[PDB]
Paper text:
Arginyl-tRNA-protein transferase 1 (ATE1) is a 58 kDa aminoacyl transferase that is conserved among nearly all eukaryotes. With the aid of a transfer RNA (tRNA) cofactor, ATE1 covalently adds arginine (arginylation) to its protein substrates to promote their degradation.
The structure of scATE1 displays an overall new fold with a compact conformation consisting of three domains, including a highly conserved GCN5-related N-acetyltransferases (GNAT) fold, a putative polypeptide substrate binding domain, and a unique variable domain. DALI analysis for the rest of the structure returned no hits with a Z-score (typical range 2~60) above 4, indicating a new fold that is not represented in the PDB. Within this new fold, the N- and C- termini of scATE1 coalesce, forming a mixed β-sheet (β1-β18-β16-β17 and β2-β3-β5-β4) facing the GNAT domain. This density localizes to a highly conserved cystine cluster, comprised of C20, C23, C94 and C95, and is indicative of metal coordination. The melting temperature of scATE1 (46 °C) decreased with increasing concentrations of EDTA, suggesting that divalent metal ions are required to stabilize ATE1. Consistently, supplementing additional zinc ions further stabilized scATE1, as evidenced by an 8 °C shift in the thermal melting curve.
Residue numbers in the entry: 1 to 503
Write the structure that this text describes.
């Protein structure tokens, strides 16, 4: 094997809203922004006391997964945290969450960038050097020219292995900026050293490292050979000032975290790191730059939109610029693009093929897109009923343990305090719709999986293939269906299921 998708069975984990990483379960007097649609807000005004607002998370733990498949899932809407690959339910969560991607060519120009670049260039180079005539707009040229003629500043690229000065800088930054005191080396290794990717991507070849370090000197027309995650360190007079942790994807570069020395707040290393990453993308032959998830309301995450980008649309797998949909996404409410040509009688047919899974979509600029979120996911939304008869049909015929629920389980009440909800709700945006799944079953498309799908039993401590779909126990069928719903038929085509009833 070289690229088998080996993970655990996805499960729905719920935690109280106070543990929210951005709102902490509160946003002030704007109770509407806690919800996703105003209709549910008006519905639950009477039930504000018994509303069990949580921080919805869906995901699973990964053991081994290829970098290209990671790119596919990152374009789908997932980014991993440590070794935990997950994404939130857009509808039932507490805070909104989208993925943004940026191109190096479409950067805007502001006075702050000019000032910071000028200060950095003045600092690193010698005072006797005369600056060239290259315009400040060409930031890549400015950065390269500044780095060519400096002796006190240099950066290096190394794998993600553990060290001691890195941990010292990490704890210094923690206790100085976030007042986190219980940091431990094991916690640091878990946070920034666990790697689902294989060792080949982790350690790489020395020639690849040489090319990555010589990135300022690569002529266009060559291919960047290295793949996987890397760490970038910013030396200055022989001592560390910052650490950049990121990864190299075939379609771009993503960012996860950043640590800098507290005493060097003068240089404002965050913006400099972002600009240097953009310069790396431009000088290299990569094309995009995934900044992470995007949250609108939260003031801590708003800075990511300064560079300008396009926020992902979960229900269509398309990328659209933020400018046309600014009013649509204002105040943090879920949206789905739509046109007057097509009605909303049934759910959106998510094309479960390569043409519609984590790849770009050239939109029709003639039509004026309009919000249809309240049409398909509103009080009179047709999703709930269709889900109901679909679940009834699957349970009646194929025996999959699907069950029906009343048209109010969008936000469960205090009754779920007795039993923690572990199942994936039927009504969830950006997922495979139930009726399409029923079409897959009834058309015999499920007959493709058998012969090359692998199911691992912890009880037997062995790996077994899928021979007959219908002969499996009902729980196995439920888990397989959930995986196919969450990640896709093509993804499950070349995956390995670590299924166990021991848990
Ligand atoms: Zn929240």
């Amino acid at each position: 094997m070289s690229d088998r998708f080996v993970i655990w069975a996805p499960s729905m984990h719920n935690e109280p809203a106070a543990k929210c990483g951005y709102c902490h379960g509160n946003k002030g007097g704007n109770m509407d922004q806690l919800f996703a649609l105003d209709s549910w807000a008006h519905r639950y005004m009477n039930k504000m006391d018994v509303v069990k607002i949580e921080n919805c998370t869906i995901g699973s733990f990964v053991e081994h997964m290829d970098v290209a498949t990671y790119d596919r899932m990152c374009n789908m809407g997932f980014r991993r945290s440590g070794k935990f690959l997950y994404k939130v339910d857009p509808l039932r969560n507490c805070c909104r969450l989208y993925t943004i991607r940026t191109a190096p060519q479409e950067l805007n120009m502001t006075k702050e960038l000019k000032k910071c670049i000028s200060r950095f260039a003045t600092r690193i180079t010698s005072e006797d050097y005369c600056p060239a005539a290259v315009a400040s707009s060409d930031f890549v040229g400015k950065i390269v020219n500044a780095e060519m003629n400096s002796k006190t500043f240099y950066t290096r690229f190394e794998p993600a292995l553990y060290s001691e000065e890195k941990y010292h800088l990490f704890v210094k930054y923690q206790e100085k900026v976030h007042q986190d005191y219980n940091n431990s080396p094991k916690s640091f290794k878990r946070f920034l050293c666990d790697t689902p990717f294989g060792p080949e991507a982790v350690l790489g070849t020395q020639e690849s490292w040489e090319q990555l370090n010589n990135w300022q000197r690569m002529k266009p027309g060559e291919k960047l050979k290295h793949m996987g995650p890397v760490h970038e360190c910013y030396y200055y007079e022989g001592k560390l000032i910052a650490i950049t942790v990121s990864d190299i994807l075939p379609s771009g570069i993503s960012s996860v975290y950043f640590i800098w020395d507290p005493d060097y707040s003068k240089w404002s290393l965050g913006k400099l790191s972002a600009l240097r990453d953009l310069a790396i993308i431009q000088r290299t032959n990569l094309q995009y730059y995934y900044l992470g998830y995007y949250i609108e309301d939260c003031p801590k995450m708003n800075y990511k939109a300064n560079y300008g980008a396009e926020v992902l649309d979960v229900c269509h797998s398309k990328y659209i610029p933020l400018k046309p949909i600014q009013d649509m996404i204002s105040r943090g409410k879920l949206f789905v693009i739509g046109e007057e040509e097509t009605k909303v009688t049934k759910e959106l047919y998510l094309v479960d093929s390569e043409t519609g899974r984590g790849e770009g979509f050239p939109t029709d600029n003639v039509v004026k897109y309009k919000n249809i979120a309240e049409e398909i996911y509103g009080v009179g939304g047709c999703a709930f009923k269709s889900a109901n008869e679909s679940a009834l049909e699957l349970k009646e015929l194929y025996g999959i343990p699907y069950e029906e629920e009343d048209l109010d389980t969008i936000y469960h009440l205090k009754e779920h305090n007795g039993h923690a909800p572990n199942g994936i709700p039927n009504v969830v945006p950006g997922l495979l719709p139930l009726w399409e799944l029923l079409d897959i079953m009834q058309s015999g498309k499920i007959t493709d999986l058998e012969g090359r799908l692998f199911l691992f039993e912890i009880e037997t401590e062995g790996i077994r293939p899928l021979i007959n779909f219908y002969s499996e126990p009902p729980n196995v069928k439920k888990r397989i269906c959930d995986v196919i719903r969450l990640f896709g038929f093509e993804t499950c085509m070349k995956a390995v299921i670590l299924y166990s009833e021991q848990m």
